[PDB]
Amino acid sequence: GAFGLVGRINARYSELGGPASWLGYPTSSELKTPDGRGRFVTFEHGSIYWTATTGPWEIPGDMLAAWGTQDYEKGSLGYPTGAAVEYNGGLRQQFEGGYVFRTSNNQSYWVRGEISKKYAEDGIFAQLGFPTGNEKLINGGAFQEFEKGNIYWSASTGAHVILHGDIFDAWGAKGWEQGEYGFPTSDQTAITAGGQTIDFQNGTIRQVNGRIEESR
């Protein structure tokens, strides 16, 4: 099928090597987005989106589908603001409202808002690995699951990291964030001699010499 492209999207397609690129051939001419702000073009293996203020960016098909689960540009992620680039054996792509990932296990998930901001801090990926799902809204705020732990957020507590393991399980036995401890107020932090510690709204849990210690 023959298609002739225009403006900054055609520009970006050319920059990627046109049909020789991973996108393959166009499967549409330039289309308007629902919200009357953007333009896009579909290709065999993904799409390019554009706004006057974000510029033209290709999104691979799997990450395009994942972006779709919160309704693409109409969702809080908004428009892509950069390319999908190699990231820890996967891809990371920045959006106005967060990030979309190809994971190293060839799955695709998004991160958004305050949880995105925490996940993007240096050292946090090393602690968590890839997302294993999208954000979940809960009573009091939100949380998200990653390979090696979770991030929890409430407006009062901010976004904080807790790892899988005995401290997480001890909090779980008391109903995690809905229970008497409430939300994590600190990131789980290593201490000397192998220990771990984290603060919650209404107490602290420590692991030292492989023993759990609790305060309320």
Structure determination method: X-ray
SS3 141: strand
Q: Is residue 80 part of a domain?
A: yes
Q: Is residue 208 part of a domain?
A: no
| Sheet of strand 141-145: strand arrangement | 136-138, 141-145, 149-154, 158-163
**φ, ψ for residue 168 (rounded to 5)?**
-60, -45
CA distance 12 to 50: 10
In total, how many domains does the chain have? 1
Q: Resolution reached, in Å?
A: 2.0
By residue range, what is the domain housing residue 146?
7-164
Cβ neighbours of 1 (radius 10 Å) = 6
**φ, ψ for residue 15 (rounded to 5)?**
-55, -30
Show the tokens assigned to 20.
């020789």
Residue 91 near residue 102 (C-beta atoms within 8 A): yes
Q: What are the angstrom distances between the C-alpha of 180 and each of 45, 159, 201, 203, 206?
A: 48, 19, 9, 8, 16
- What angle is formed at CA 18 by the lines to CA 13 and CA 20, rounded to 5 degrees? 145
Q: Is residue 184 part of a domain?
A: no
